[PDB]
Amino acid sequence: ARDPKHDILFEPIQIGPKTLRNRFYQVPHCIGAGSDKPGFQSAHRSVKAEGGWAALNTEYCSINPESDDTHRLSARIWDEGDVRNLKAMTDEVHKYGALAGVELWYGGAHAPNMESRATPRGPSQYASEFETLSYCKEMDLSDIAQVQQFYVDAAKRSRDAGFDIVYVYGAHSYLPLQFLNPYYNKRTDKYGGSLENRARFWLETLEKVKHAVGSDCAIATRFGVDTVYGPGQIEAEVDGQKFVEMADSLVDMWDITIGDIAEWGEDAGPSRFYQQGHTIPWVKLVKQVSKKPVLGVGRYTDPEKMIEIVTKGYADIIGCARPSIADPFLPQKVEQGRYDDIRVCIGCNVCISRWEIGGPPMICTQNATAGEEYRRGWHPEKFRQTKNKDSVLIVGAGPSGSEAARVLMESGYTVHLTDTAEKIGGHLNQVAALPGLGEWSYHRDYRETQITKLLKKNKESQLALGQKPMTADDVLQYGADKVIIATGARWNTDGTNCLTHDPIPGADASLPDQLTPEQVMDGKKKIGKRVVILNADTYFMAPSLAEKLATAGHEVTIVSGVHLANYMHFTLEYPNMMRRLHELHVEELGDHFCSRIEPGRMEIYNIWGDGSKRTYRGPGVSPRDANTSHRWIEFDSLVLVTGRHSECTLWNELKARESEWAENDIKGIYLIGDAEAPRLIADATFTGHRVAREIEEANPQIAIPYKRETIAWGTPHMPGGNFKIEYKV
Amino acid sequence: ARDPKHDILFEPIQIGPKTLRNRFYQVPHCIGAGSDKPGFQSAHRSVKAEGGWAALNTEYCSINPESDDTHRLSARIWDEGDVRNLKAMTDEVHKYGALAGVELWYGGAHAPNMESRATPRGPSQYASEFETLSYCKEMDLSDIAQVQQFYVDAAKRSRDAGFDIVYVYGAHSYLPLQFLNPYYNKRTDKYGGSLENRARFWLETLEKVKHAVGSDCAIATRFGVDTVYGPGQIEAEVDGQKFVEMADSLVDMWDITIGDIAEWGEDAGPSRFYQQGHTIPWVKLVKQVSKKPVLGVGRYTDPEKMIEIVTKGYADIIGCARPSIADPFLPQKVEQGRYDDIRVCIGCNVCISRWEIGGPPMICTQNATAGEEYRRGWHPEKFRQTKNKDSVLIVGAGPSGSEAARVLMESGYTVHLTDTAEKIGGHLNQVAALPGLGEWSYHRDYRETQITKLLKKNKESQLALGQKPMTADDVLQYGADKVIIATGARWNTDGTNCLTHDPIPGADASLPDQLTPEQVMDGKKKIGKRVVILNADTYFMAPSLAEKLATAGHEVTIVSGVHLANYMHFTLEYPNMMRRLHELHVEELGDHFCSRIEPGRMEIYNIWGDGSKRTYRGPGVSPRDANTSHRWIEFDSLVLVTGRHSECTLWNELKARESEWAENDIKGIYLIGDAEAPRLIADATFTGHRVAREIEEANPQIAIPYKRETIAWGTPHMPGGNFKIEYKV
Ligand SMILES: *c1c(C)c(C)cc2c1nc1c(=O)[nH]c(=O)nc-1n2C[C@H](O)[C@H](O)[C@H](O)COP(=O)(O)O
Ligand SMILES: *c1c(C)c(C)cc2c1nc1c(=O)[nH]c(=O)nc-1n2C[C@H](O)[C@H](O)[C@H](O)COP(=O)(O)O
Ligand SMILES: Nc1ncnc2c1ncn2[C@@H]1O[C@H](COP(=O)(O)OP(=O)(O)O)[C@@H](O)[C@H]1O
């Protein structure tokens, strides 16, 4: 039964000329579809509509080619061709009884315009702090009028495309906020200086947009009410509440964020630094002055926390981005009282990393169907049922083997899942114990819960933990029709790394003064005072180990041959991670790698130490002057973070005996997850989901084709257009 | 007329079953189109076919989704959709009598598969040294047979698509090279160990592809004959030549490069480091052993250098990528003896920088129609002719103003171009005087030459240099119908920068101990011994000034608030630039910026010195602990490289008197290039090209729409497919 206290989340609420059916609201978020992948855009949003979300929004939607985010992918509403592509989404969302919203965007200099080559315009000329080679033209009064007109023409196309909700977007330090914020706005005319003057651009845009479409569409606005930068950008109790009072009469609904664009991880709070509800102290300030409905995101996954912010009067509506990606059916699950089916977001920001890299589609660590709904036909809650009695043995219960188990049981198969480990979750169990990573637990907590539930409904299925390791003969004599090897990866013990692909002389994790991540996380092997971490990985392991050891009292130096924490730029974790290492006194030596190791010392070299001039010097000889930067540094312990290898011994043994499978009635054995190749957790989860989805295909080791959303030559994007080459001569 | 010694370049040569009409060959190169923008792909290659190139190749062309380069854009030949898209290019290239070629690609772990999410396969499992989070599965024998079959199926699709030339691609350390090269290949079976074994994968692939399509298509191979890394990878006189001998009977034509993928600026050599012909010492080693036609790229633009390598017997064919982008008509121009019309590539690698960023279309510093042929209808050598006698005044002869003059004169307009400078070229004249950048001067040399010749045939046009600066009154009284303002930008003199968008206290380049780039390049202002460069720019200025200053004997420290030379990662200059700074003893302080300057000293701070934990602390205060890393450093001279600002005073004065334009018979005044917003040189050039092409449009200040190559919802990419959402249930 639904807890009756949760009934309030299912009450409707008026927003201008529209009604939201409940309090679950998907705020605008990127997915890597834009107006470019209309199947993905429409499936991803309409699965959530079917899942019960009251309103579904596009990501940021450019109003004109001079706000082109290429190389990143935004939605666009430039012309009739975009109207058609985006209407595929509004039509589909409407079929499930939800509203659709579009977030009208203009970036100023933050949009680098790499496709359009156009010049962005802004309140003053500046080079973007985020796109540092991108500059804008300072607007004159006619520029201001013409960009306001872009907004009006876009709002009109938006109504043509079937949208119910139209935003003017002034969060993440985009144009309306640029004019509001003296960090950007240095004008001394009537659009700069006092708050009334600084607000003028956004207020006139709202008035013009509302005048164009507002009796048909709700006019929303998204506002970074505090830049979380201190004085000198926007402060909630200085300009923020006061802007709200100025704009309140024009806005049908407030959508509130904090932070800027360069560090928008302050908005999309990674769980490493921020808990559910972290934005409350700023967001709550808006309902203190607004007489309109208000939401403000804060990684809300828990209906207990949701009813708290509503009954205490801090927000009227529950806005979510990530939680809707991890679980498009979150609302229906709360409505039906299926709390234990809720697939809770871990705030890892892998979904965001995709968009930040610029171009790739979204993926999600929890939800292997995000991005897959359209092109592979994978609905998160509906699985093809087996028509046979086949059984599957799965060796290994980390993200990949556990997801395979969950999906195969959902599809009706008999599944035996086994692991030496005491509990489900494989390498994630030690990872989630790293400083800050505690919520990454939820990935294996969800799978433990679901697998336990699923066992009750197939009676032949089985979960066996803390078992002896499976051997090739155990597998061969197990009795399963098909077998999945999901045995994971381990960190290298011998210095092998992506720069040289070879061991490092003297590297050996069995020695008393060297350790792998696993040995560090296990916490039995002694670690001395001075610790060097030798790093050839660009994600979280080395910085997380550095933080762990430094908080535990060690003097830590990281020697990195690749850009330290580079992938954390994309998950937005990097700025706070670097501040954390700095507070903790961790020393960083970038651009160095290690050519050999001995007890208590290691030799390092600057990676740019070879001569700059290449000549042909013949065979057997380097074409550059020799690198003479080598020097010795000391340590008491050396932690090797140099890369990973697949644990695929068992697979190798079974394959060498493939001639024996048929006589043992084994029809197939497949290799997934880290054991095939070291993957992101999201991608290991994906491989388990995919093999389970395709377990009946000719070769389940290899994905079948997905639908591609690429133009077909001979079909013009513009309706009635001419697709042929035409020179202007 | 053509020099008779160039006649050799126009002799045909047989390659297997096909005939090249001349010795001008466009090797495979990225353009940002692949099979996804079939308009762009077909227009870009077919203009060159019209321009006399004997063969035009697609870029690297994936044979299967488990070699997907997303976020970077490759061609693809995975299915019938791609066959239709690429056939637009083969049909268009054939219309002009050239051969069309495709480059069959499989990247191993170098392809990060961010769209497909499939697992790449390789000779041994490694993490790519270029994509450092991307790992492959080690190939067993069936894997090898399967990937070989992918090449075969792609080659059959290629013949369907109408290609004449099919490559097995084994350069830039892609898969055939990975099996060849013990840096990657650690196998101990019959595909590893000896040369014969290491070559077996590439040899079998060639035999299979030749078998499938060889009667119909020339089989070419691209080979990184030396990795330029010394022993430990491929060396030309060790494995290189011996491999050519083993494969010679299978290959119709050799296409030779040097270098790997992580540092492929050794192949696409930047003029900063490499002259025309820089590859000859390695390339000529192939004809020492091969009996087949051979080419090897080397930034060839001069026909004198071209006949040298053919008459000496070092190559049979002139392969080009960049020269063909700068001038699609280079071969016709040589054929007709129009040497002074040749637009010579400057080796800036801005074209490549787009590809490297991942996703955007190619652009070109010399050729402002690259990427624009299809979507704007801009042919590089055909100009719509004016039908009126309108005159245009152009103030400033830098890359934008001189491009605008050139195009307007080619279009039949009367133009008067004026500048205070003694020579055409604007800010490029000092830029090209920086260490290594002398070849960048070709951009202005081309325009100086072209403008001089256009004046001889456009008799009412005029060039005036060494002029007094134009004032607003001079412009208003000048007598032109239209005016273009192209007055450029300057480096900031008060510390204004992209981090704070404000001046720095104490910054002022009028002080004797502080200098701008222009003051350094001018050479008059004295510079002291200890130099600090303060940098907030990510491209070439700060590194290039550091080189110049350290080579002149100064002790140089670079304090950089942004990632130093970040943009040079994309131009492939970064690795030799860092080696150059290291060998000159230039010190770098990354992650710091500057809070105030005084005579001989400046206060710097660590950019990550703020506390890592954000909390609500109310207005007037930072949400984090204070940054306490501030410290002073001394200098004798401080070079300010903090950002640029438009020089738009003349513009602002004319706009302030817009009410007088009609009295003075001025129909419009437009603002282009760096004076509208500081741009890359390629983009400043584009703005002048654009306004010239669009001088008759309603508002030439703003680009008209271009044709968009994005899918139309309702049309499936696969012929006969179903575009509608369908779930697998
Ligand atoms: C993209 C990505 C994938 C994320 C998760 C957030 C996001 C994305 N793109 C956005 C955009 O197009 N416009 C916009 O206004 N906001 C965008 N976001 C931020 C998102 O809307 C939320 O503000 C944050 O994710 C925090 O909310 P929550 O995920 O904790 O609920
Ligand atoms: C992309 C880019 C834009 C550049 C100019 C070169 C290039 C690109 N992509 C390539 C790819 O798809 N396959 C391939 O084999 N080579 C590719 N290239 C390298 C190019 O082919 C030449 O080897 C170099 O540019 C050197 O030749 P040149 O430009 O000096 O004539
Ligand atoms: N022979 C084996 N028998 C049983 N379990 C195994 C065996 N080999 C490895 N495992 C288990 O396989 C799991 C792989 O999990 P993990 O490393 O998280 O991989 P992934 O991320 O691919 O899911 C580990 O929990 C490990 O205990």
Ligand SMILES: Nc1ncnc2c1ncn2[C@@H]1O[C@H](COP(=O)(O)OP(=O)(O)O)[C@@H](O)[C@H]1O
């Ligand atoms: N008032 C003026 N009258 C004539 N020329 C000017 C005036 N102001 C600036 N210039 C010239 O304009 C040119 C601008 O060139 P440049 O800086 O290279 O801009 P861009 O990169 O946009 O082409 C310089 O050569 C400069 O001398």
Ligand code: SF4
């Ligand atoms: S990738 Fe991590 S963050 Fe993003 S929605 Fe999924 S799960 Fe939450």
Ligand code: SF4
């Ligand atoms: S961008 Fe530069 S290197 Fe590339 S083709 Fe054009 S002029 Fe040559």
